[PDB]
Amino acid sequence: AMGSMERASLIQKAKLAEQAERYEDMAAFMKGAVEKGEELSCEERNLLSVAYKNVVGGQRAAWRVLSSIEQKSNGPEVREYREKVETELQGVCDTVLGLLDSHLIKEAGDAESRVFYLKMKGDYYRYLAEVATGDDKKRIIDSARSAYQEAMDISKKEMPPTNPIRLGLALNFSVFHYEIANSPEEAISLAKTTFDEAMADLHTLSEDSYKDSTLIMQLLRDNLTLWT
Amino acid sequence: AMGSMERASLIQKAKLAEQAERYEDMAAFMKGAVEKGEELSCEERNLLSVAYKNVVGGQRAAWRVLSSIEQKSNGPEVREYREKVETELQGVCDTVLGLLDSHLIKEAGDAESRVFYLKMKGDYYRYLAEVATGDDKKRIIDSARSAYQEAMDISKKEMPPTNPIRLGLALNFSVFHYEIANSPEEAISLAKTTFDEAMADLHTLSEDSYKDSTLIMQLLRDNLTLWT
Amino acid sequence: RPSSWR
Amino acid sequence: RPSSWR
Numbered sequence A, B: 001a002m003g004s005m006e007r008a009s010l011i012q013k014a015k016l017a018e019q020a021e022r023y024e025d026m027a028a029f030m031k032g033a034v035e036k037g038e039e040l041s042c043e044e045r046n047l048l049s050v051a052y053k054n055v056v057g058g059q060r061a062a063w064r065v066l067s068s069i070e071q072k073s074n075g076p077e078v079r080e081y082r083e084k085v086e087t088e089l090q091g092v093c094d095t096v097l098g099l100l101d102s103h104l105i106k107e108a109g110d111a112e113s114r115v116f117y118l119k120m121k122g123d124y125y126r127y128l129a130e131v132a133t134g135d136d137k138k139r140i141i142d143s144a145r146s147a148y149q150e151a152m153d154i155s156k157k158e159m160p161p162t163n164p165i166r167l168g169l170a171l172n173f174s175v176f177h178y179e180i181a182n183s184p185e186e187a188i189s190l191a192k193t194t195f196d197e198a199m200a201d202l203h204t205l206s207e208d209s210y211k212d213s214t215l216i217m218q219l220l221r222d223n224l225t226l227w228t
Numbered sequence C, D: 001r002p003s004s005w006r
Protein backbone atom coordinates (compact mmCIF):
# COMPACT_ATOMS: atom_id res chain seq x y z
CA ALA A 1 0.00 0.00 0.00
CA MET A 2 3.08 2.20 0.39
CA GLY A 3 4.55 1.65 -3.08
CA SER A 4 3.62 5.15 -4.24
CA MET A 5 5.20 7.05 -1.32
CA GLU A 6 8.77 8.32 -1.39
CA ARG A 7 11.23 6.44 0.82
CA ALA A 8 12.15 9.67 2.62
CA SER A 9 8.48 10.49 3.19
CA LEU A 10 7.87 7.02 4.66
CA ILE A 11 10.77 7.51 7.08
CA GLN A 12 9.53 10.98 8.03
CA LYS A 13 6.01 9.67 8.67
CA ALA A 14 7.36 6.74 10.69
CA LYS A 15 8.98 9.28 13.01
CA LEU A 16 5.72 11.24 13.18
CA ALA A 17 3.81 8.04 13.97
CA GLU A 18 6.24 7.30 16.81
CA GLN A 19 5.61 10.74 18.33
CA ALA A 20 1.86 10.12 18.05
CA GLU A 21 2.27 6.61 19.54
CA ARG A 22 0.63 5.20 16.38
CA TYR A 23 2.78 2.09 16.19
CA GLU A 24 0.67 0.18 13.66
CA ASP A 25 1.08 3.13 11.27
CA MET A 26 4.78 3.29 12.17
CA ALA A 27 5.27 -0.36 11.23
CA ALA A 28 3.37 0.03 7.96
CA PHE A 29 5.51 3.04 7.01
CA MET A 30 8.72 1.21 7.86
CA LYS A 31 7.61 -1.91 5.97
CA GLY A 32 7.08 0.32 2.95
CA ALA A 33 10.53 1.83 3.43
CA VAL A 34 12.15 -1.62 3.61
CA GLU A 35 10.32 -2.70 0.45
CA LYS A 36 11.98 0.12 -1.50
CA GLY A 37 14.92 -2.31 -1.64
CA GLU A 38 17.66 -0.10 -0.21
CA GLU A 39 19.64 -1.04 2.87
CA LEU A 40 18.64 0.61 6.15
CA SER A 41 20.73 3.09 8.12
CA CYS A 42 21.36 2.65 11.84
CA GLU A 43 18.55 5.06 12.73
CA GLU A 44 16.22 3.44 10.20
CA ARG A 45 16.87 -0.02 11.63
CA ASN A 46 15.91 1.29 15.07
CA LEU A 47 12.67 2.74 13.68
CA LEU A 48 11.80 -0.63 12.13
CA SER A 49 12.51 -2.45 15.40
CA VAL A 50 10.67 0.05 17.63
CA ALA A 51 7.58 -0.07 15.42
CA TYR A 52 7.13 -3.84 15.29
CA LYS A 53 8.27 -4.39 18.89
CA ASN A 54 5.43 -2.15 20.06
CA VAL A 55 2.86 -3.75 17.75
CA VAL A 56 3.73 -7.33 18.71
CA GLY A 57 4.19 -6.28 22.34
CA GLY A 58 0.55 -5.24 22.55
CA GLN A 59 -0.49 -8.49 20.86
CA ARG A 60 1.60 -10.60 23.25
CA ALA A 61 0.14 -8.79 26.28
CA ALA A 62 -3.39 -9.39 24.99
CA TRP A 63 -2.63 -13.04 24.17
CA ARG A 64 -1.33 -13.56 27.71
CA VAL A 65 -4.51 -12.08 29.23
CA LEU A 66 -6.73 -14.28 27.06
CA SER A 67 -4.61 -17.42 27.57
CA SER A 68 -4.85 -16.95 31.34
CA ILE A 69 -8.64 -16.60 31.14
CA GLU A 70 -8.75 -19.66 28.87
CA GLN A 71 -6.71 -21.76 31.31
CA LYS A 72 -8.97 -20.82 34.23
CA SER A 73 -11.94 -21.89 32.09
CA ASN A 74 -10.47 -25.36 31.54
CA GLY A 75 -18.60 -22.02 25.34
CA PRO A 76 -16.02 -21.58 22.57
CA GLU A 77 -15.74 -17.78 22.76
CA VAL A 78 -12.60 -17.51 24.92
CA ARG A 79 -10.71 -20.02 22.77
CA GLU A 80 -12.00 -18.40 19.57
CA TYR A 81 -10.89 -14.90 20.58
CA ARG A 82 -7.52 -16.09 21.87
CA GLU A 83 -7.06 -17.84 18.52
CA LYS A 84 -7.97 -14.63 16.68
CA VAL A 85 -5.37 -12.58 18.56
CA GLU A 86 -2.89 -15.46 18.19
CA THR A 87 -3.38 -15.56 14.42
CA GLU A 88 -2.92 -11.79 14.16
CA LEU A 89 0.28 -11.99 16.22
CA GLN A 90 1.63 -14.79 14.01
CA GLY A 91 0.80 -12.71 10.94
CA VAL A 92 2.88 -9.79 12.22
CA CYS A 93 5.79 -12.08 13.12
CA ASP A 94 5.63 -13.65 9.65
CA THR A 95 5.67 -10.18 8.10
CA VAL A 96 8.79 -9.16 10.03
CA LEU A 97 10.56 -12.44 9.28
CA GLY A 98 9.63 -11.99 5.62
CA LEU A 99 11.25 -8.56 5.53
CA LEU A 100 14.40 -9.99 7.12
CA ASP A 101 14.48 -12.85 4.61
CA SER A 102 13.60 -10.62 1.62
CA HIS A 103 16.12 -9.22 1.68
CA LEU A 104 17.53 -7.37 4.70
CA ILE A 105 19.77 -10.11 6.10
CA LYS A 106 21.43 -11.21 2.85
CA GLU A 107 22.41 -7.60 2.07
CA ALA A 108 23.69 -6.85 5.61
CA GLY A 109 27.48 -7.08 5.52
CA ASP A 110 28.54 -4.89 8.43
CA ALA A 111 28.53 -6.41 11.91
CA GLU A 112 26.19 -3.77 13.35
CA SER A 113 23.55 -4.38 10.67
CA ARG A 114 23.89 -8.16 10.42
CA VAL A 115 23.82 -8.73 14.19
CA PHE A 116 20.83 -6.37 14.47
CA TYR A 117 18.78 -8.27 11.88
CA LEU A 118 19.73 -11.72 13.21
CA LYS A 119 18.76 -10.65 16.73
CA MET A 120 15.44 -9.49 15.24
CA LYS A 121 14.98 -12.88 13.54
CA GLY A 122 15.61 -14.63 16.85
CA ASP A 123 13.15 -12.34 18.64
CA TYR A 124 10.25 -12.92 16.28
CA TYR A 125 10.78 -16.67 16.15
CA ARG A 126 10.81 -16.45 19.95
CA TYR A 127 7.43 -14.69 19.86
CA LEU A 128 6.13 -17.41 17.54
CA ALA A 129 7.48 -19.99 19.99
CA GLU A 130 5.59 -18.39 22.89
CA VAL A 131 2.27 -19.38 21.27
CA ALA A 132 3.35 -22.56 19.45
CA THR A 133 1.85 -25.93 20.40
CA GLY A 134 1.90 -28.03 17.22
CA ASP A 135 4.15 -30.28 15.16
CA ASP A 136 6.39 -27.32 14.25
CA LYS A 137 7.04 -26.04 17.78
CA LYS A 138 10.49 -27.62 18.12
CA ARG A 139 11.47 -26.31 14.68
CA ILE A 140 10.31 -22.80 15.63
CA ILE A 141 12.41 -22.95 18.80
CA ASP A 142 15.45 -24.13 16.83
CA SER A 143 14.96 -21.35 14.27
CA ALA A 144 15.10 -18.82 17.12
CA ARG A 145 18.16 -20.55 18.59
CA SER A 146 19.95 -20.65 15.23
CA ALA A 147 19.40 -16.95 14.54
CA TYR A 148 20.48 -15.91 18.03
CA GLN A 149 23.54 -18.17 17.81
CA GLU A 150 24.77 -16.74 14.50
CA ALA A 151 24.23 -13.22 15.83
CA MET A 152 26.15 -14.14 18.98
CA ASP A 153 29.11 -15.59 17.05
CA ILE A 154 29.41 -12.42 14.95
CA SER A 155 28.99 -10.07 17.92
CA LYS A 156 31.72 -11.80 19.92
CA LYS A 157 34.18 -11.56 17.01
CA GLU A 158 33.33 -8.08 15.71
CA MET A 159 31.95 -6.02 18.62
CA PRO A 160 33.25 -4.82 22.00
CA PRO A 161 31.54 -6.39 25.03
CA THR A 162 29.85 -3.05 25.85
CA ASN A 163 28.26 -2.62 22.41
CA PRO A 164 24.53 -1.97 23.03
CA ILE A 165 23.43 -4.29 20.21
CA ARG A 166 25.69 -7.04 21.57
CA LEU A 167 24.29 -6.45 25.07
CA GLY A 168 20.65 -6.43 23.96
CA LEU A 169 21.25 -9.58 21.91
CA ALA A 170 22.76 -11.41 24.90
CA LEU A 171 19.90 -10.18 27.10
CA ASN A 172 17.26 -11.56 24.73
CA PHE A 173 19.11 -14.82 24.05
CA SER A 174 19.27 -15.34 27.81
CA VAL A 175 15.51 -14.74 28.02
CA PHE A 176 15.11 -17.30 25.23
CA HIS A 177 17.10 -19.82 27.28
CA TYR A 178 15.05 -19.18 30.43
CA GLU A 179 11.56 -18.81 28.97
CA ILE A 180 11.55 -20.91 25.78
CA ALA A 181 14.33 -23.53 25.88
CA ASN A 182 13.81 -24.58 29.53
CA SER A 183 17.51 -23.86 30.17
CA PRO A 184 17.57 -21.52 33.19
CA GLU A 185 21.20 -22.34 34.01
CA GLU A 186 22.27 -21.40 30.47
CA ALA A 187 20.22 -18.20 30.85
CA ILE A 188 21.89 -17.29 34.15
CA SER A 189 25.39 -18.12 32.90
CA LEU A 190 24.95 -16.02 29.76
CA ALA A 191 23.58 -13.02 31.67
CA LYS A 192 26.38 -13.14 34.25
CA THR A 193 29.21 -13.57 31.74
CA THR A 194 27.75 -10.82 29.53
CA PHE A 195 27.44 -8.45 32.49
CA ASP A 196 30.94 -9.16 33.82
CA GLU A 197 32.74 -8.73 30.49
CA ALA A 198 30.82 -5.50 29.86
CA MET A 199 31.80 -4.26 33.33
CA ALA A 200 35.48 -4.78 32.47
CA ASP A 201 35.18 -2.78 29.22
CA LEU A 202 33.34 0.28 30.58
CA HIS A 203 36.63 2.11 31.22
CA THR A 204 37.10 2.52 27.45
CA LEU A 205 33.85 4.44 26.96
CA SER A 206 32.81 8.06 26.78
CA GLU A 207 30.24 9.39 29.25
CA ASP A 208 27.41 9.01 26.73
CA SER A 209 28.43 5.50 25.64
CA TYR A 210 28.84 4.54 29.30
CA LYS A 211 25.23 5.59 29.87
CA ASP A 212 23.99 3.53 26.91
CA SER A 213 25.84 0.40 28.01
CA THR A 214 25.06 0.51 31.74
CA LEU A 215 21.34 0.95 30.95
CA ILE A 216 21.14 -2.44 29.23
CA MET A 217 23.55 -3.89 31.77
CA GLN A 218 20.97 -3.11 34.48
CA LEU A 219 18.39 -5.21 32.62
CA LEU A 220 20.81 -8.15 32.78
CA ARG A 221 21.15 -7.49 36.52
CA ASP A 222 17.36 -7.27 36.93
CA ASN A 223 16.96 -10.72 35.36
CA LEU A 224 19.76 -12.23 37.46
CA THR A 225 18.07 -10.85 40.59
CA LEU A 226 14.77 -12.36 39.41
CA TRP A 227 16.36 -15.72 38.56
CA THR A 228 18.70 -16.22 41.55
CA ALA B 1 -18.20 -8.77 9.43
CA MET B 2 -19.98 -9.82 12.63
CA GLY B 3 -23.28 -10.89 11.06
CA SER B 4 -22.57 -14.59 11.61
CA MET B 5 -21.73 -14.35 15.34
CA GLU B 6 -24.34 -14.77 18.06
CA ARG B 7 -25.33 -11.59 19.90
CA ALA B 8 -24.39 -13.17 23.23
CA SER B 9 -21.01 -14.24 21.85
CA LEU B 10 -20.32 -10.71 20.60
CA ILE B 11 -21.09 -9.30 24.06
CA GLN B 12 -18.90 -11.94 25.72
CA LYS B 13 -16.00 -11.18 23.37
CA ALA B 14 -16.43 -7.43 23.89
CA LYS B 15 -15.86 -8.03 27.60
CA LEU B 16 -12.82 -10.19 26.81
CA ALA B 17 -11.46 -7.48 24.50
CA GLU B 18 -11.84 -4.92 27.30
CA GLN B 19 -9.81 -7.11 29.67
CA ALA B 20 -7.13 -7.46 26.97
CA GLU B 21 -7.24 -3.68 26.30
CA ARG B 22 -8.08 -4.45 22.65
CA TYR B 23 -10.47 -1.56 22.18
CA GLU B 24 -10.66 -1.69 18.38
CA ASP B 25 -11.83 -5.31 18.67
CA MET B 26 -14.18 -4.28 21.49
CA ALA B 27 -15.81 -1.63 19.29
CA ALA B 28 -16.16 -4.02 16.35
CA PHE B 29 -17.83 -6.62 18.59
CA MET B 30 -20.21 -4.04 20.05
CA LYS B 31 -21.03 -2.63 16.61
CA GLY B 32 -21.97 -6.17 15.58
CA ALA B 33 -24.12 -6.52 18.70
CA VAL B 34 -25.94 -3.25 17.97
CA GLU B 35 -26.56 -4.34 14.37
CA LYS B 36 -28.48 -7.39 15.61
CA GLY B 37 -31.33 -4.89 15.99
CA GLU B 38 -32.23 -5.47 19.64
CA GLU B 39 -32.15 -2.69 22.22
CA LEU B 40 -29.12 -2.56 24.52
CA SER B 41 -29.14 -3.20 28.26
CA CYS B 42 -27.53 -0.77 30.70
CA GLU B 43 -24.34 -2.85 30.85
CA GLU B 44 -24.30 -3.26 27.08
CA ARG B 45 -24.63 0.49 26.54
CA ASN B 46 -21.60 1.01 28.79
CA LEU B 47 -19.60 -1.54 26.78
CA LEU B 48 -20.46 0.30 23.55
CA SER B 49 -19.44 3.65 25.05
CA VAL B 50 -16.22 2.38 26.65
CA ALA B 51 -15.10 0.74 23.40
CA TYR B 52 -15.54 3.73 21.09
CA LYS B 53 -14.43 6.28 23.70
CA ASN B 54 -11.08 4.48 23.93
CA VAL B 55 -10.71 4.13 20.15
CA VAL B 56 -11.51 7.77 19.39
CA GLY B 57 -9.54 8.87 22.46
CA GLY B 58 -6.37 7.43 20.98
CA GLN B 59 -7.15 9.06 17.64
CA ARG B 60 -7.79 12.46 19.25
CA ALA B 61 -4.52 12.25 21.20
CA ALA B 62 -2.62 11.41 18.02
CA TRP B 63 -4.39 14.17 16.06
CA ARG B 64 -3.42 16.69 18.74
CA VAL B 65 0.25 15.64 18.59
CA LEU B 66 0.30 15.94 14.79
CA SER B 67 -1.65 19.20 14.72
CA SER B 68 0.84 20.73 17.16
CA ILE B 69 3.77 19.63 14.98
CA GLU B 70 1.94 20.97 11.92
CA GLN B 71 1.38 24.37 13.54
CA LYS B 72 5.05 24.68 14.50
CA SER B 73 5.93 23.90 10.88
CA ASN B 74 3.79 26.78 9.60
CA GLY B 75 7.16 19.23 2.72
CA PRO B 76 3.59 17.92 2.75
CA GLU B 77 4.20 14.90 5.01
CA VAL B 78 3.05 16.40 8.33
CA ARG B 79 -0.17 17.72 6.80
CA GLU B 80 -0.74 14.46 4.91
CA TYR B 81 -0.35 12.29 8.01
CA ARG B 82 -2.47 14.58 10.17
CA GLU B 83 -5.13 14.39 7.45
CA LYS B 84 -4.88 10.58 7.46
CA VAL B 85 -5.44 10.35 11.22
CA GLU B 86 -8.15 13.02 10.95
CA THR B 87 -10.00 11.05 8.27
CA GLU B 88 -9.81 7.86 10.34
CA LEU B 89 -11.15 9.70 13.39
CA GLN B 90 -14.04 11.14 11.36
CA GLY B 91 -14.80 7.66 10.07
CA VAL B 92 -15.13 6.28 13.59
CA CYS B 93 -17.32 9.21 14.67
CA ASP B 94 -19.54 8.68 11.61
CA THR B 95 -19.82 4.99 12.48
CA VAL B 96 -20.95 5.73 16.05
CA LEU B 97 -23.40 8.41 14.91
CA GLY B 98 -24.74 5.96 12.34
CA LEU B 99 -25.41 3.36 15.02
CA LEU B 100 -27.22 5.97 17.11
CA ASP B 101 -29.31 7.06 14.11
CA SER B 102 -29.95 3.49 12.90
CA HIS B 103 -31.63 2.83 15.15
CA LEU B 104 -30.62 3.13 18.81
CA ILE B 105 -32.07 6.56 19.58
CA LYS B 106 -35.49 6.10 17.96
CA GLU B 107 -36.04 2.87 19.94
CA ALA B 108 -34.83 4.33 23.27
CA GLY B 109 -37.90 5.19 25.33
CA ASP B 110 -36.60 5.08 28.89
CA ALA B 111 -34.84 8.15 30.25
CA GLU B 112 -31.66 6.27 31.14
CA SER B 113 -31.27 4.88 27.61
CA ARG B 114 -32.40 7.96 25.68
CA VAL B 115 -30.23 10.38 27.68
CA PHE B 116 -27.27 8.00 27.32
CA TYR B 117 -27.55 7.85 23.53
CA LEU B 118 -28.16 11.59 23.11
CA LYS B 119 -25.13 12.34 25.27
CA MET B 120 -23.17 9.99 23.01
CA LYS B 121 -24.45 11.83 19.92
CA GLY B 122 -23.33 15.13 21.43
CA ASP B 123 -19.91 13.69 22.29
CA TYR B 124 -19.13 12.40 18.81
CA TYR B 125 -20.33 15.55 17.09
CA ARG B 126 -18.07 17.35 19.57
CA TYR B 127 -15.14 15.20 18.45
CA LEU B 128 -15.99 16.01 14.83
CA ALA B 129 -16.11 19.69 15.80
CA GLU B 130 -12.61 19.51 17.31
CA VAL B 131 -11.14 18.87 13.84
CA ALA B 132 -13.66 20.77 11.70
CA THR B 133 -12.56 23.78 9.65
CA GLY B 134 -14.87 23.89 6.62
CA ASP B 135 -18.27 25.12 5.50
CA ASP B 136 -20.01 22.60 7.79
CA LYS B 137 -18.20 23.50 11.03
CA LYS B 138 -21.02 25.64 12.45
CA ARG B 139 -23.56 22.95 11.57
CA ILE B 140 -21.43 20.30 13.30
CA ILE B 141 -21.24 22.47 16.42
CA ASP B 142 -25.01 23.00 16.37
CA SER B 143 -25.61 19.26 15.95
CA ALA B 144 -23.57 18.66 19.11
CA ARG B 145 -25.43 21.45 20.93
CA SER B 146 -28.84 20.12 19.85
CA ALA B 147 -28.11 16.57 21.01
CA TYR B 148 -26.71 17.73 24.36
CA GLN B 149 -29.67 20.08 24.84
CA GLU B 150 -32.31 17.40 24.26
CA ALA B 151 -30.44 15.05 26.60
CA MET B 152 -30.28 17.83 29.20
CA ASP B 153 -34.01 18.59 28.99
CA ILE B 154 -34.88 14.91 29.52
CA SER B 155 -32.37 14.42 32.33
CA LYS B 156 -33.66 17.42 34.28
CA LYS B 157 -37.26 16.16 34.04
CA GLU B 158 -36.70 12.43 34.55
CA MET B 159 -33.51 11.97 36.61
CA PRO B 160 -32.32 12.98 40.09
CA PRO B 161 -29.49 15.54 40.15
CA THR B 162 -27.05 12.87 41.40
CA ASN B 163 -27.74 10.41 38.56
CA PRO B 164 -24.31 9.49 37.09
CA ILE B 165 -25.55 9.75 33.49
CA ARG B 166 -27.05 13.17 34.23
CA LEU B 167 -23.78 14.24 35.88
CA GLY B 168 -21.57 12.96 33.06
CA LEU B 169 -23.83 14.63 30.51
CA ALA B 170 -23.61 17.99 32.29
CA LEU B 171 -19.84 17.58 32.61
CA ASN B 172 -19.41 16.99 28.88
CA PHE B 173 -21.89 19.70 27.84
CA SER B 174 -19.90 22.12 29.99
CA VAL B 175 -16.71 21.02 28.22
CA PHE B 176 -18.52 21.62 24.93
CA HIS B 177 -19.35 25.16 26.06
CA TYR B 178 -15.77 25.88 27.14
CA GLU B 179 -13.81 24.15 24.37
CA ILE B 180 -16.07 24.24 21.30
CA ALA B 181 -18.69 26.99 21.63
CA ASN B 182 -16.34 29.68 23.04
CA SER B 183 -18.74 30.11 25.98
CA PRO B 184 -16.57 29.75 29.11
CA GLU B 185 -19.10 31.54 31.33
CA GLU B 186 -21.83 29.12 30.25
CA ALA B 187 -19.40 26.27 30.94
CA ILE B 188 -18.60 27.53 34.44
CA SER B 189 -22.24 28.24 35.29
CA LEU B 190 -23.35 24.77 34.18
CA ALA B 191 -20.58 23.01 36.13
CA LYS B 192 -21.29 24.99 39.31
CA THR B 193 -25.08 24.57 39.19
CA THR B 194 -24.70 20.86 38.40
CA PHE B 195 -22.27 20.36 41.28
CA ASP B 196 -24.38 22.31 43.79
CA GLU B 197 -27.66 20.56 43.01
CA ALA B 198 -25.92 17.18 43.17
CA MET B 199 -24.40 18.13 46.55
CA ALA B 200 -27.91 18.81 47.91
CA ASP B 201 -29.21 15.40 46.76
CA LEU B 202 -26.38 13.21 48.12
CA HIS B 203 -28.25 12.64 51.40
CA THR B 204 -30.76 10.43 49.56
CA LEU B 205 -28.12 7.97 48.34
CA SER B 206 -26.72 4.66 49.50
CA GLU B 207 -23.00 4.35 50.21
CA ASP B 208 -22.33 2.82 46.78
CA SER B 209 -24.44 5.37 44.89
CA TYR B 210 -22.79 8.15 46.90
CA LYS B 211 -19.41 6.89 45.67
CA ASP B 212 -20.58 6.83 42.04
CA SER B 213 -21.97 10.36 42.17
CA THR B 214 -19.14 12.06 44.08
CA LEU B 215 -16.60 10.58 41.64
CA ILE B 216 -18.10 12.47 38.69
CA MET B 217 -18.77 15.45 40.93
CA GLN B 218 -15.01 15.73 41.49
CA LEU B 219 -14.47 16.02 37.73
CA LEU B 220 -16.82 19.01 37.72
CA ARG B 221 -14.77 20.47 40.57
CA ASP B 222 -11.51 19.79 38.72
CA ASN B 223 -12.76 21.77 35.72
CA LEU B 224 -14.02 24.65 37.87
CA THR B 225 -10.59 24.81 39.53
CA LEU B 226 -8.98 24.83 36.08
CA TRP B 227 -11.37 27.48 34.74
CA THR B 228 -11.53 29.89 37.70
CA ARG C 1 -7.04 20.12 28.98
CA PRO C 2 -10.39 19.95 30.85
CA SER C 3 -11.89 16.70 32.07
CA SER C 4 -14.74 15.10 30.17
CA TRP C 5 -16.34 11.99 31.63
CA ARG C 6 -13.86 9.11 31.72
CA ARG D 1 8.19 -11.77 33.70
CA PRO D 2 11.89 -11.29 32.80
CA SER D 3 13.17 -8.23 30.99
CA SER D 4 14.00 -8.43 27.30
CA TRP D 5 15.52 -5.38 25.65
CA ARG D 6 13.08 -2.46 25.66
Ligand SMILES: *Cc1ccc(-n2cnc(C(F)(F)F)c2)cc1
Residues within 6 Å of the ligand: A046, A049, A119, A164, A165, A167, A168, A169, A212, A213, D005
Ligand atom coordinates in the same frame (compact mmCIF):
# COMPACT_ATOMS: atom_id res chain seq x y z
C1 LIG E 1 17.86 -5.03 20.67
C2 LIG E 1 18.50 -3.65 20.79
C3 LIG E 1 18.05 -2.61 20.00
C4 LIG E 1 18.64 -1.37 20.11
C5 LIG E 1 19.67 -1.15 21.02
N1 LIG E 1 20.26 0.17 21.09
C6 LIG E 1 20.54 0.91 20.01
N2 LIG E 1 21.06 2.07 20.42
C7 LIG E 1 21.10 2.05 21.73
C8 LIG E 1 21.64 3.20 22.59
F1 LIG E 1 20.86 4.30 22.40
F2 LIG E 1 22.92 3.47 22.21
F3 LIG E 1 21.61 2.84 23.91
C9 LIG E 1 20.59 0.86 22.16
C10 LIG E 1 20.13 -2.20 21.81
C11 LIG E 1 19.54 -3.45 21.69
Ligand SMILES: *Cc1ccc(-n2cnc(C(F)(F)F)c2)cc1
Residues within 6 Å of the ligand: B046, B049, B119, B164, B165, B167, B168, B169, B212, B213, C005
Ligand atom coordinates in the same frame (compact mmCIF):
# COMPACT_ATOMS: atom_id res chain seq x y z
C1 LIG F 1 -21.04 9.55 30.11
C2 LIG F 1 -21.21 8.59 31.28
C3 LIG F 1 -21.13 7.23 31.07
C4 LIG F 1 -21.29 6.36 32.14
C5 LIG F 1 -21.52 6.85 33.41
N1 LIG F 1 -21.69 5.89 34.49
C6 LIG F 1 -22.41 4.77 34.37
N2 LIG F 1 -22.36 4.11 35.54
C7 LIG F 1 -21.63 4.82 36.37
C8 LIG F 1 -21.32 4.42 37.81
F1 LIG F 1 -20.62 3.25 37.80
F2 LIG F 1 -22.50 4.23 38.47
F3 LIG F 1 -20.59 5.39 38.43
C9 LIG F 1 -21.20 5.94 35.70
C10 LIG F 1 -21.62 8.21 33.62
C11 LIG F 1 -21.46 9.08 32.56
Ligand SMILES: [Ca+2]
Residues within 6 Å of the ligand: A039, A107, A108, A109, A110
Ligand atom coordinates in the same frame (compact mmCIF):
# COMPACT_ATOMS: atom_id res chain seq x y z
CA1 LIG G 1 25.46 -4.41 2.22
Ligand SMILES: [Ca+2]
Residues within 6 Å of the ligand: B039, B107, B108, B109, B110
Ligand atom coordinates in the same frame (compact mmCIF):
# COMPACT_ATOMS: atom_id res chain seq x y z
CA1 LIG H 1 -37.75 0.87 23.48
